[PDB]
Design a protein around this ligand. Sequence first.
Ligand code: HEM
Length: 394
Amino acid sequence: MTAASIDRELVPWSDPEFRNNPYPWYRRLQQDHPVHKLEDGTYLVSRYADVSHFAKLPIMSVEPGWADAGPWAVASDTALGSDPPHHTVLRRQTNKWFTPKLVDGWVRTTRELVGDLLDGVEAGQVIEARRDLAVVPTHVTMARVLQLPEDDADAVMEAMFEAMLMQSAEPADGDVDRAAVAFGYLSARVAEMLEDKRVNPGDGLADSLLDAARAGEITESEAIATILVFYAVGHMAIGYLIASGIELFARRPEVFTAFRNDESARAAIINEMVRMDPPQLSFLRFPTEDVEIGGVLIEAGSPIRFMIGAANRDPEVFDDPDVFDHTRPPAASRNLSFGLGPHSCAGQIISRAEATTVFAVLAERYERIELAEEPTVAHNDFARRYRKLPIVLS
Ligand code: HEM
């Protein structure tokens, strides 16, 4: 045995079966190696109590990983790659556009587009739900908040699929070059859109970010990067959650019937979907001083990968963690899928309302969702993805 063969036994990042369902390997990792140092120097932290306490500490920086991330170093000029104090100012620029009463307006776009798609079908028609119920409605919702052209969902989704390959812990040969191609496309399309906006300003979130850079609250590079990331990821993790929830309502029709029959249960159904199938499985921090976790001394500047998916199945927190149950008590009703601490997801309020909206419009019209064929997926060790989800509604 070697350190490398031990790591492959515990977390075979490239293995198709581990990509399709990592949860059996997470259970072993969490039981026997809850703070595990990989041969590359990354520490894997997988117990809920340890991720929830340590990952949000102020000593946990987000700067080093994104700064060294090649094509992804665009995130250094956003909240995702910025520490406080300037992190607070970058987040106020977007948080102020996604308060609950503003989100109630933005998700009218999601409702209108789902209603258009459903009005157009014949009875028994196969709907490709990944594009038509998840990616297009969410892309256009966010493009309309930004006040950017809304017609490019398919190329933006292809670009982001290519850009996410290199976020694997074991990128394939060529994956960093695929991300440079993808970001080259998105940066050129955003530059063309913002040149049009300079000449003809509107009053959306992209104009608010450009005004904040002109006022000196953020830099021009931070305005442009934040517009690019909200535009490009508006469809992505939220499109995965909507497709995952549609597959759950087909495989477990009694959950869709409960969603139909009890409005007061709808948030908790969605949150149980989110606990069980997080679209992002982990995230990195780099502590600014030495820190002991699980009796292991981690030196300043080491990479710590907090394993969200593994934590969300911790039987110290959730009884029968592999069973879907939307009636868990208040102390076992929350999860780490939108992160925590200052970098908790800047899309959380709009994402929960977009999923609520797509599921509510389907429940207004239909009693049952069925899979027309098995779904086609393209998961890796970092991010989950559907390629195709053909369904029939009745
Ligand atoms: C409208 C869609 C979304 C947008 C625009 C969006 C945007 C962002 C941004 C800008 C951040 C960084 C915030 C900061 O560093 O202060 C973030 C963090 C995060 N998001 Fe989202 N997000 C979206 C949907 C989702 C969904 C649906 C999930 C999972 C259910 C998700 C999971 C996460 C996680 C786990 C983080 C924390 C990453 C870290 O701490 O390093 N996001 N999101």
